[PDB]
Amino acid sequence: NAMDKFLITGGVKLEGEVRISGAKNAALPLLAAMILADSPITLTNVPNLKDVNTLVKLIGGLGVTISYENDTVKADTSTLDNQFAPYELVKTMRASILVLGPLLARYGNAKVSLPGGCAIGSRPVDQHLKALEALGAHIEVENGYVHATVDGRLKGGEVVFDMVTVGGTENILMAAALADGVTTIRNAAREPEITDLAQMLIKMGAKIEGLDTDTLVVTGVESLHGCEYAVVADRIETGSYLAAAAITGGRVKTTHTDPSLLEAVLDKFEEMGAEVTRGDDWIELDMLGKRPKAVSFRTLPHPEFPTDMQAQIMAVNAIGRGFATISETIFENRFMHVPELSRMGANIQVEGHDAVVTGVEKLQAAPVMATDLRASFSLVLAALVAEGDTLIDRIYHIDRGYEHVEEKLQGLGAKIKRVS
Amino acid sequence: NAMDKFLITGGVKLEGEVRISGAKNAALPLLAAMILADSPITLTNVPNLKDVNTLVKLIGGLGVTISYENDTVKADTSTLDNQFAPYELVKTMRASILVLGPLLARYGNAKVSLPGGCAIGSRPVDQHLKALEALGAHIEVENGYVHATVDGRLKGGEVVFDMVTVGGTENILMAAALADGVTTIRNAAREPEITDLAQMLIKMGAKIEGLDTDTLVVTGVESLHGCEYAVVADRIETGSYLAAAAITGGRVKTTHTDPSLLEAVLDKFEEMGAEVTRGDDWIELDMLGKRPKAVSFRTLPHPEFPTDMQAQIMAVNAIGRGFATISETIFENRFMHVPELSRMGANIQVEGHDAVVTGVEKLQAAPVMATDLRASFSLVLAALVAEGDTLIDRIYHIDRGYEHVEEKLQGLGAKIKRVS
Ligand SMILES: *[C@](C)(OP(=O)(O)O)C(=O)O
Ligand SMILES: *[C@](C)(OP(=O)(O)O)C(=O)O
Ligand code: NA
Ligand code: NA
Ligand code: NA
Ligand code: NA
Ligand code: NA
Ligand code: NA
Ligand code: NA
Ligand code: NA
Ligand code: NA
């Protein structure tokens, strides 16, 4: 939907509640894990996102019978007839690579297009392939496809990630679940989407120790069954809507969430001067009509400050008091929103992966262009506080990760319209 | 032209000649300089490129009477009626900012949209603005527009670039040419497009000392007149077509060029094992049917190895003999071709701005996507040597900098077709 734009009038102090959807970043590996199920499997709390639809399409293309209605995906792998992920879908989304592990582990074969570039500057998939080789996979990468094979089951092995990789951890965890023997996975990602995947695998019959730690110990089983599972709440969507309160001086309650998924972010909101109240499954941020204090942060793997909140908190800092330091350590090209925020009057100075934001009293509306998922939400935040009417082009990126975004913001009083 | 593609069959040893067009990177500042001319001005050897057409459109939008036919741009500023460069064109290309200096210097007013992001990761335009302020400009950046004003003429001053900036040097050189007094420009870019601009300004009546050095000394004049000027040959187009010989083991003669514009590149071709012959205005590279030796390089300001040749030489190195240590120092996100070359079988390892290419004997055709101007030519080079039929999507980027690229390559024996 390359032509869609948002038209936003800034200046409304946002107030109300938002129901948080299932995590985009958990839905994708959980969908891939359905390939492992030997009886029908149902996922609920699934957000209606572009990436979800792409992976549902990919899985259907394997021959799996699959339905996606409302927030619910049902899949029956009895009809699966191939292990092929085509270029046309994989170029749409790197996360399509998450089918590699389960296809290989269950069927002994997988052919998946080699991912190309990621707009925000990603590492190649080398670590995913190395991990699978540690379990006995033979991997050829040629004519633009990864060809992975194994005779019989993968074999339990010793996997160690040289750098933290969320997707590599997911891929190998799925593969190890059906391997013959015990697999150790060291330097595993601790992101809670890993834990959510592990819990669903356990519900399906897997044997996994070390949840929420950097060392996962998997005892492979012969087969996994279907189950019903609800996707964990989206911690990034949660932080994003709380940031909408922070930037506008308002008060937003996010329901159907879990503050334990985003403690580092909540701490930063408190440092801004916000009053953060919470319960077991809800959070409220009240900025009390105050200008937030600018807060420094360094993106790092969970449980530290998440890269997927960086652009959004940078936007809040743009109108914050004082100045703040930002360091992106996870991605190589995740400051694409900076020149766009600068068009709206922000004072941001960058050198490589380090940025310094000097907060300004007011932003001014100007036409801007979204470059990636979280950048699009960063520009929405800026537009919500800016003086005047901002047009944001290429807003399609937002649909990869924020369902019903216009509706959710309108419910808080936002003057926002999608033209498409 | 977002959906144009190239379909290339690799494996032909390329042989023949290519007439080199005027430099894209000189045509843009020379076009902007036409704003200074108090009588009709004519540029010849102008390449028919998207960026040229954009700047011609922008200049026409100022009210300047302008015609672009064949390789010739004719302009008469007698009808100029505004000093405004709109968002819609500036978001098309950063180089639209080159009208800022001459508009301000001649008319005392310029309103130019603030450039947003550059795909390959560029610095902001802060240095351009600081330089203009050194000549007495008042600059307000608001509602996404740079508003520059001065009462009467700019005043000669001391300009110092803290980092080399080709566009900043161009903008300030044009502005200084009409200032009242003497301007010193230190740490000036030495790119030969600066020299070409300076020579045209001198032909128009300007007073400029220090050509081809890092210290330009400008004595402002009251007015500049029109002239007829021929754009310097394109050194990057030259290197690009010589690289097509190198990668295919062929023999290509580039005519209408100047080897003194690209000595660092020619030395690297010799290091590959190619026979480079040359005259005053032509070059021939004969690779003698041999596999090139992989060659290391570090991009640096002219006269060192140019960033605008990096992607192309990386493609040649992908099939070369040995390791090539490639270091990019000019742009922050100019390895976007790496994942695409990897899809074709290249062995390239990246860490930040450092890359290591391990040459492979053969590439295999696979669908790939161009991400920027020079990346698109890099993928064309890879497709020309790869085994099979490569489809390159988003080839429109190539039209920003390579005139008649299909025809020029077809003249060398290439099996290349544009579908559009
Ligand atoms: C990268 C991997 O891009 P993609 O999802 O493939 O568009 C990312 O944004 O993380
Ligand atoms: C940057 C500046 O992008 P643009 O020309 O504005 O598309 C570049 O490629 O140098
Ligand atoms: Na993700
Ligand atoms: Na191979
Ligand atoms: Na970068
Ligand atoms: Na800035
Ligand atoms: Na340029
Ligand atoms: Na642009
Ligand atoms: Na301002
Ligand atoms: Na004359
Ligand atoms: Na690689």
Coordinates of N, CA and C in Angstrom, one line a residue, chain B residues 97-291:
Chain B
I97 N 19.6 21.2 -3.3 CA 20.1 22.2 -2.4 C 21.1 23.1 -3.1
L98 N 21.7 22.7 -4.2 CA 22.7 23.5 -4.9 C 22.2 24.8 -5.4
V99 N 20.9 25.0 -5.5 CA 20.3 26.3 -5.9 C 20.4 27.3 -4.8
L100 N 20.6 26.9 -3.5 CA 20.6 27.8 -2.4 C 21.6 28.9 -2.5
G101 N 22.8 28.5 -2.7 CA 23.9 29.4 -2.8 C 23.8 30.5 -3.9
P102 N 23.5 30.1 -5.2 CA 23.4 31.1 -6.2 C 22.1 32.0 -6.1
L103 N 21.0 31.4 -5.6 CA 19.8 32.2 -5.4 C 20.1 33.3 -4.4
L104 N 20.6 32.9 -3.2 CA 20.9 33.8 -2.2 C 21.9 34.9 -2.6
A105 N 23.0 34.5 -3.3 CA 24.0 35.4 -3.7 C 23.6 36.4 -4.8
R106 N 22.7 36.0 -5.7 CA 22.3 36.9 -6.7 C 21.0 37.7 -6.3
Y107 N 20.1 37.1 -5.7 CA 18.8 37.7 -5.4 C 18.6 38.1 -3.9
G108 N 19.4 37.6 -3.0 CA 19.3 38.0 -1.6 C 18.3 37.2 -0.8
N109 N 17.8 36.1 -1.5 CA 16.7 35.4 -0.9 C 16.7 34.0 -1.5
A110 N 16.4 33.0 -0.7 CA 16.3 31.6 -1.2 C 15.5 30.8 -0.1
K111 N 14.5 30.1 -0.6 CA 13.7 29.2 0.3 C 13.7 27.8 -0.3
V112 N 14.4 26.9 0.4 CA 14.6 25.6 -0.2 C 14.2 24.5 0.8
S113 N 13.5 23.5 0.4 CA 13.1 22.5 1.3 C 14.3 21.8 2.0
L114 N 14.3 21.6 3.3 CA 15.4 20.9 3.9 C 15.4 19.5 3.5
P115 N 16.6 19.0 3.0 CA 16.6 17.6 2.5 C 16.4 16.6 3.7
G116 N 15.7 15.6 3.3 CA 15.5 14.4 4.2 C 16.6 13.4 4.1
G117 N 16.3 12.2 4.2 CA 17.3 11.1 4.2 C 17.8 10.8 2.8
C118 N 19.0 10.3 2.7 CA 19.7 9.8 1.5 C 19.8 8.3 1.7
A119 N 19.4 7.5 0.7 CA 19.4 6.0 0.9 C 20.7 5.5 1.4
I120 N 21.8 6.0 0.8 CA 23.2 5.5 1.2 C 23.8 6.1 2.4
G121 N 23.0 6.9 3.1 CA 23.4 7.4 4.4 C 24.3 8.6 4.4
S122 N 23.7 9.8 4.2 CA 24.5 11.0 4.1 C 24.5 11.9 5.3
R123 N 25.5 12.8 5.4 CA 25.6 13.8 6.4 C 24.4 14.8 6.2
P124 N 23.9 15.5 7.3 CA 22.9 16.6 7.0 C 23.6 17.8 6.3
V125 N 22.8 18.8 5.9 CA 23.4 19.9 5.2 C 24.0 21.1 6.0
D126 N 24.2 20.8 7.3 CA 24.7 21.8 8.3 C 25.9 22.6 7.7
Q127 N 26.9 21.9 7.1 CA 28.1 22.6 6.6 C 27.8 23.6 5.5
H128 N 26.8 23.3 4.7 CA 26.4 24.3 3.7 C 25.9 25.5 4.3
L129 N 25.0 25.4 5.3 CA 24.4 26.5 6.0 C 25.5 27.3 6.8
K130 N 26.4 26.6 7.5 CA 27.4 27.3 8.2 C 28.3 28.1 7.3
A131 N 28.6 27.6 6.1 CA 29.4 28.3 5.2 C 28.7 29.6 4.7
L132 N 27.4 29.5 4.4 CA 26.7 30.6 3.9 C 26.6 31.7 5.0
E133 N 26.4 31.2 6.3 CA 26.4 32.2 7.4 C 27.7 32.9 7.5
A134 N 28.8 32.3 7.2 CA 30.2 32.9 7.2 C 30.2 34.1 6.2
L135 N 29.4 34.1 5.2 CA 29.3 35.2 4.2 C 28.2 36.2 4.5
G136 N 27.6 36.1 5.7 CA 26.6 37.0 6.1 C 25.1 36.6 6.0
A137 N 24.9 35.4 5.5 CA 23.5 34.9 5.4 C 22.8 34.8 6.7
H138 N 21.6 35.1 6.8 CA 20.7 34.8 7.9 C 19.9 33.5 7.5
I139 N 20.0 32.5 8.3 CA 19.3 31.3 7.9 C 18.4 30.8 9.0
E140 N 17.1 30.6 8.6 CA 16.1 30.1 9.5 C 15.6 28.8 8.9
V141 N 15.6 27.7 9.7 CA 15.1 26.4 9.2 C 13.8 26.2 10.0
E142 N 12.7 26.2 9.3 CA 11.4 26.1 9.9 C 10.3 25.6 8.9
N143 N 9.3 24.9 9.4 CA 8.2 24.2 8.6 C 8.8 23.4 7.5
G144 N 10.0 22.9 7.7 CA 10.7 22.0 6.8 C 11.4 22.7 5.6
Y145 N 11.5 24.1 5.7 CA 12.2 24.9 4.7 C 13.3 25.6 5.3
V146 N 14.4 25.7 4.5 CA 15.6 26.6 4.8 C 15.2 27.9 4.2
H147 N 15.1 29.0 5.0 CA 14.9 30.3 4.6 C 16.2 31.1 4.7
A148 N 16.9 31.4 3.6 CA 18.1 32.2 3.7 C 17.9 33.6 3.1
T149 N 18.4 34.6 3.8 CA 18.3 36.0 3.4 C 19.6 36.7 3.7
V150 N 19.7 37.8 2.9 CA 20.8 38.8 3.2 C 20.4 40.1 2.6
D151 N 20.7 41.2 3.2 CA 20.5 42.6 2.7 C 21.6 42.9 1.8
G152 N 21.3 43.1 0.5 CA 22.4 43.4 -0.5 C 23.2 42.1 -0.7
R153 N 24.4 42.3 -1.1 CA 25.3 41.2 -1.4 C 25.8 40.5 -0.1
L154 N 26.2 39.2 -0.3 CA 26.9 38.5 0.7 C 28.2 39.2 0.8
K155 N 28.9 39.0 1.9 CA 30.2 39.6 2.2 C 31.3 38.6 2.3
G156 N 32.4 38.9 1.6 CA 33.5 38.0 1.6 C 33.9 37.6 3.0
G157 N 34.2 36.3 3.2 CA 34.5 35.8 4.6 C 35.4 34.6 4.5
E158 N 35.6 34.0 5.7 CA 36.5 32.9 5.9 C 35.6 31.7 6.1
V159 N 35.6 30.8 5.2 CA 34.9 29.5 5.2 C 35.8 28.4 5.5
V160 N 35.4 27.5 6.4 CA 36.2 26.4 6.8 C 35.3 25.1 7.0
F161 N 35.5 24.1 6.1 CA 34.8 22.9 6.2 C 35.4 22.0 7.2
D162 N 34.6 21.5 8.2 CA 35.2 20.6 9.2 C 35.3 19.2 8.7
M163 N 34.7 18.9 7.6 CA 34.8 17.6 7.0 C 34.6 17.9 5.5
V164 N 35.2 17.1 4.6 CA 35.1 17.4 3.2 C 33.7 17.2 2.7
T165 N 33.2 18.2 2.0 CA 31.8 18.2 1.5 C 31.9 18.7 0.0
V166 N 31.6 17.8 -0.9 CA 31.6 18.2 -2.3 C 30.4 19.2 -2.6
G167 N 29.2 18.9 -2.1 CA 28.1 19.8 -2.3 C 28.3 21.1 -1.6
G168 N 28.8 21.1 -0.4 CA 29.0 22.3 0.4 C 30.1 23.2 -0.3
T169 N 31.1 22.6 -0.9 CA 32.1 23.4 -1.6 C 31.5 24.0 -2.9
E170 N 30.6 23.3 -3.6 CA 29.9 23.8 -4.7 C 29.0 25.0 -4.4
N171 N 28.2 24.8 -3.3 CA 27.3 25.8 -3.0 C 28.0 27.1 -2.6
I172 N 29.1 27.0 -1.8 CA 29.7 28.2 -1.3 C 30.6 28.8 -2.4
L173 N 31.1 28.1 -3.3 CA 31.8 28.6 -4.4 C 30.9 29.5 -5.3
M174 N 29.7 29.0 -5.6 CA 28.8 29.8 -6.3 C 28.4 31.1 -5.6
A175 N 28.1 31.0 -4.3 CA 27.7 32.1 -3.5 C 28.9 33.2 -3.4
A176 N 30.1 32.7 -3.1 CA 31.2 33.6 -3.0 C 31.5 34.3 -4.2
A177 N 31.2 33.8 -5.4 CA 31.5 34.4 -6.7 C 30.8 35.8 -6.8
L178 N 29.7 36.0 -6.1 CA 29.0 37.3 -6.2 C 29.1 38.1 -4.9
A179 N 29.8 37.6 -3.9 CA 30.0 38.3 -2.7 C 30.8 39.6 -2.8
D180 N 30.6 40.5 -1.9 CA 31.4 41.7 -1.9 C 32.7 41.5 -1.1
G181 N 33.8 41.3 -1.8 CA 35.1 41.0 -1.2 C 35.6 39.7 -1.5
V182 N 36.7 39.3 -0.7 CA 37.4 38.1 -0.9 C 37.0 37.0 0.1
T183 N 36.7 35.8 -0.4 CA 36.4 34.7 0.4 C 37.5 33.6 0.3
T184 N 37.9 33.1 1.5 CA 38.8 32.0 1.5 C 38.0 30.8 1.9
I185 N 38.2 29.7 1.1 CA 37.4 28.4 1.4 C 38.5 27.4 1.7
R186 N 38.6 27.0 3.0 CA 39.6 26.0 3.4 C 38.9 24.6 3.6
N187 N 39.8 23.6 3.4 CA 39.3 22.2 3.3 C 38.3 22.0 2.3
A188 N 38.5 22.7 1.1 CA 37.6 22.6 0.0 C 37.8 21.2 -0.6
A189 N 36.7 20.7 -1.1 CA 36.8 19.4 -1.9 C 37.6 19.7 -3.2
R190 N 38.3 18.6 -3.5 CA 39.2 18.7 -4.7 C 38.6 17.8 -5.9
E191 N 37.4 17.3 -5.7 CA 36.8 16.5 -6.8 C 36.8 17.3 -8.1
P192 N 37.0 16.6 -9.2 CA 37.2 17.5 -10.4 C 35.9 18.1 -10.9
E193 N 34.7 17.7 -10.3 CA 33.5 18.5 -10.6 C 33.6 19.9 -10.0
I194 N 34.3 20.0 -8.9 CA 34.5 21.4 -8.3 C 35.3 22.2 -9.3
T195 N 36.4 21.6 -9.8 CA 37.2 22.3 -10.8 C 36.4 22.7 -12.0
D196 N 35.5 21.8 -12.5 CA 34.7 22.1 -13.7 C 33.8 23.3 -13.4
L197 N 33.1 23.2 -12.2 CA 32.3 24.4 -11.8 C 33.1 25.7 -11.7
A198 N 34.3 25.6 -11.1 CA 35.1 26.8 -11.0 C 35.5 27.4 -12.4
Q199 N 35.8 26.5 -13.3 CA 36.2 26.9 -14.7 C 35.0 27.5 -15.4
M200 N 33.8 27.0 -15.2 CA 32.7 27.7 -15.8 C 32.4 29.0 -15.2
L201 N 32.5 29.1 -13.8 CA 32.3 30.4 -13.2 C 33.4 31.4 -13.7
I202 N 34.6 31.0 -13.8 CA 35.6 31.9 -14.4 C 35.3 32.3 -15.8
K203 N 34.7 31.4 -16.6 CA 34.3 31.8 -18.0 C 33.1 32.8 -18.0
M204 N 32.4 32.8 -16.9 CA 31.3 33.7 -16.7 C 31.7 35.0 -16.1
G205 N 33.0 35.1 -15.7 CA 33.5 36.4 -15.2 C 34.0 36.3 -13.7
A206 N 34.0 35.1 -13.1 CA 34.4 35.0 -11.7 C 35.9 35.1 -11.6
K207 N 36.4 35.3 -10.4 CA 37.8 35.4 -10.0 C 38.0 34.3 -8.9
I208 N 38.7 33.3 -9.3 CA 38.9 32.1 -8.4 C 40.3 31.6 -8.6
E209 N 41.1 31.6 -7.4 CA 42.4 31.0 -7.3 C 42.4 29.7 -6.5
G210 N 43.4 28.9 -6.8 CA 43.5 27.6 -6.0 C 42.8 26.4 -6.6
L211 N 42.5 26.5 -7.9 CA 41.8 25.3 -8.5 C 42.7 24.0 -8.3
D212 N 41.9 22.9 -8.1 CA 42.5 21.6 -7.8 C 43.2 21.5 -6.5
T213 N 43.0 22.5 -5.6 CA 43.6 22.4 -4.3 C 42.5 22.5 -3.2
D214 N 42.9 22.3 -2.0 CA 42.0 22.4 -0.9 C 41.8 23.9 -0.3
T215 N 42.3 24.9 -1.0 CA 42.2 26.2 -0.6 C 41.8 27.1 -1.8
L216 N 40.5 27.4 -1.9 CA 40.0 28.3 -2.9 C 39.9 29.7 -2.4
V217 N 40.3 30.7 -3.3 CA 40.3 32.1 -2.9 C 39.5 32.8 -4.0
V218 N 38.4 33.3 -3.6 CA 37.4 33.9 -4.5 C 37.3 35.4 -4.3
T219 N 37.4 36.1 -5.4 CA 37.2 37.6 -5.3 C 35.8 37.8 -5.9
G220 N 34.8 38.2 -5.2 CA 33.5 38.4 -5.7 C 33.5 39.5 -6.7
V221 N 32.5 39.3 -7.7 CA 32.3 40.3 -8.7 C 30.8 40.7 -8.6
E222 N 30.5 41.8 -9.2 CA 29.1 42.3 -9.1 C 28.1 41.5 -9.9
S223 N 28.5 41.0 -11.1 CA 27.7 40.1 -11.8 C 28.5 39.1 -12.7
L224 N 27.8 38.1 -13.0 CA 28.4 37.0 -13.9 C 27.5 37.0 -15.1
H225 N 28.2 36.7 -16.3 CA 27.5 36.7 -17.6 C 27.3 35.2 -18.0
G226 N 26.5 35.0 -19.0 CA 26.3 33.7 -19.6 C 27.5 33.3 -20.5
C227 N 27.6 32.1 -20.9 CA 28.6 31.6 -21.7 C 28.1 30.2 -22.3
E228 N 29.0 29.6 -23.1 CA 28.7 28.2 -23.5 C 29.8 27.4 -22.9
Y229 N 29.4 26.3 -22.3 CA 30.3 25.4 -21.5 C 29.9 24.0 -21.7
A230 N 30.9 23.1 -21.8 CA 30.7 21.7 -22.0 C 31.1 20.9 -20.7
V231 N 30.1 20.1 -20.2 CA 30.3 19.4 -19.0 C 31.5 18.4 -19.1
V232 N 32.4 18.4 -18.1 CA 33.5 17.5 -18.1 C 33.0 16.0 -18.2
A233 N 33.8 15.1 -18.7 CA 33.5 13.7 -18.8 C 33.2 13.1 -17.5
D234 N 32.4 12.1 -17.5 CA 32.0 11.3 -16.2 C 33.0 10.3 -15.9
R235 N 33.8 10.6 -14.9 CA 34.9 9.6 -14.4 C 34.3 8.3 -13.8
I236 N 33.1 8.4 -13.2 CA 32.5 7.2 -12.6 C 31.9 6.4 -13.7
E237 N 31.2 7.0 -14.7 CA 30.8 6.2 -15.8 C 31.9 5.5 -16.5
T238 N 33.0 6.2 -16.6 CA 34.3 5.7 -17.3 C 34.7 4.5 -16.5
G239 N 34.9 4.6 -15.2 CA 35.4 3.4 -14.4 C 34.4 2.3 -14.5
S240 N 33.1 2.6 -14.5 CA 32.1 1.6 -14.5 C 32.2 0.7 -15.8
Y241 N 32.3 1.3 -16.9 CA 32.4 0.6 -18.2 C 33.8 -0.2 -18.3
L242 N 34.8 0.4 -17.8 CA 36.1 -0.3 -17.8 C 36.0 -1.6 -16.9
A243 N 35.2 -1.4 -15.8 CA 35.0 -2.6 -14.9 C 34.2 -3.7 -15.6
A244 N 33.3 -3.3 -16.6 CA 32.6 -4.3 -17.3 C 33.6 -5.2 -18.1
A245 N 34.6 -4.6 -18.7 CA 35.7 -5.4 -19.3 C 36.4 -6.3 -18.2
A246 N 36.8 -5.7 -17.1 CA 37.5 -6.4 -16.1 C 36.8 -7.6 -15.6
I247 N 35.5 -7.5 -15.3 CA 34.7 -8.6 -14.7 C 34.5 -9.7 -15.7
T248 N 34.4 -9.4 -17.0 CA 34.1 -10.4 -18.0 C 35.3 -10.9 -18.8
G249 N 36.5 -10.4 -18.4 CA 37.8 -10.8 -19.1 C 37.9 -10.2 -20.5
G250 N 37.1 -9.2 -20.8 CA 37.0 -8.5 -22.0 C 37.9 -7.3 -22.3
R251 N 37.5 -6.5 -23.2 CA 38.3 -5.4 -23.7 C 37.4 -4.3 -24.0
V252 N 37.4 -3.2 -23.3 CA 36.6 -2.0 -23.5 C 37.4 -0.8 -23.6
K253 N 37.1 0.0 -24.6 CA 37.7 1.4 -24.8 C 36.6 2.4 -24.5
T254 N 36.9 3.3 -23.5 CA 36.1 4.4 -23.2 C 36.6 5.6 -23.9
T255 N 35.8 6.3 -24.8 CA 36.2 7.5 -25.5 C 35.5 8.7 -24.9
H256 N 36.0 9.9 -25.3 CA 35.5 11.1 -24.8 C 35.6 11.2 -23.2
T257 N 36.7 10.8 -22.7 CA 37.0 10.9 -21.3 C 38.3 11.5 -21.0
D258 N 38.9 11.3 -19.8 CA 40.1 11.9 -19.4 C 40.7 11.0 -18.3
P259 N 41.7 10.2 -18.5 CA 42.2 9.3 -17.5 C 42.8 10.1 -16.3
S260 N 43.2 11.3 -16.4 CA 43.6 12.1 -15.2 C 42.5 12.3 -14.2
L261 N 41.3 12.0 -14.6 CA 40.2 12.2 -13.6 C 40.0 10.9 -12.7
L262 N 40.8 9.9 -13.0 CA 40.5 8.6 -12.2 C 41.8 7.8 -12.1
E263 N 42.9 8.4 -11.8 CA 44.2 7.7 -11.6 C 44.1 6.6 -10.6
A264 N 43.5 6.9 -9.4 CA 43.4 5.9 -8.4 C 42.7 4.6 -8.8
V265 N 41.6 4.8 -9.6 CA 40.9 3.7 -10.1 C 41.7 2.9 -11.2
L266 N 42.3 3.6 -12.1 CA 43.2 3.0 -13.1 C 44.3 2.2 -12.5
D267 N 44.9 2.7 -11.4 CA 45.9 1.9 -10.7 C 45.4 0.6 -10.2
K268 N 44.2 0.7 -9.6 CA 43.5 -0.6 -9.1 C 43.3 -1.6 -10.2
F269 N 42.8 -1.1 -11.4 CA 42.7 -2.0 -12.5 C 44.0 -2.7 -12.9
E270 N 45.1 -1.9 -12.9 CA 46.4 -2.5 -13.2 C 46.7 -3.5 -12.2
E271 N 46.4 -3.3 -10.9 CA 46.7 -4.2 -9.9 C 45.9 -5.5 -10.1
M272 N 44.7 -5.4 -10.7 CA 43.9 -6.6 -11.0 C 44.6 -7.5 -12.0
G273 N 45.6 -6.9 -12.8 CA 46.2 -7.7 -13.9 C 45.8 -7.2 -15.3
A274 N 45.0 -6.2 -15.3 CA 44.5 -5.7 -16.6 C 45.6 -4.9 -17.3
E275 N 45.6 -4.9 -18.7 CA 46.4 -4.0 -19.5 C 45.6 -2.7 -19.7
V276 N 46.1 -1.6 -19.2 CA 45.4 -0.4 -19.3 C 46.3 0.5 -20.3
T277 N 45.7 0.9 -21.4 CA 46.3 1.8 -22.4 C 45.5 3.0 -22.4
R278 N 46.1 4.1 -22.8 CA 45.4 5.4 -22.7 C 46.0 6.4 -23.6
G279 N 45.2 7.5 -23.8 CA 45.7 8.6 -24.5 C 45.1 9.8 -23.7
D280 N 45.2 10.9 -24.2 CA 44.7 12.1 -23.6 C 43.3 12.2 -23.3
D281 N 42.4 11.6 -24.1 CA 41.0 11.6 -24.0 C 40.3 10.2 -24.1
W282 N 41.1 9.1 -23.9 CA 40.5 7.8 -24.0 C 41.3 6.8 -23.2
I283 N 40.7 5.7 -22.9 CA 41.3 4.7 -22.1 C 40.8 3.3 -22.6
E284 N 41.7 2.3 -22.6 CA 41.3 1.0 -23.0 C 41.7 0.0 -21.9
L285 N 40.8 -0.8 -21.4 CA 41.2 -1.9 -20.4 C 41.0 -3.2 -21.2
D286 N 42.1 -4.0 -21.2 CA 42.0 -5.3 -21.7 C 42.4 -6.3 -20.6
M287 N 41.4 -7.1 -20.2 CA 41.7 -8.1 -19.1 C 42.2 -9.4 -19.7
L288 N 42.4 -9.5 -21.0 CA 43.1 -10.6 -21.6 C 42.6 -12.0 -21.3
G289 N 41.3 -12.1 -21.1 CA 40.6 -13.3 -20.8 C 41.0 -13.9 -19.4
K290 N 41.6 -13.1 -18.6 CA 42.1 -13.6 -17.3 C 41.1 -13.2 -16.2
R291 N 41.1 -14.0 -15.1 CA 40.4 -13.7 -13.9 C 41.1 -12.6 -13.2

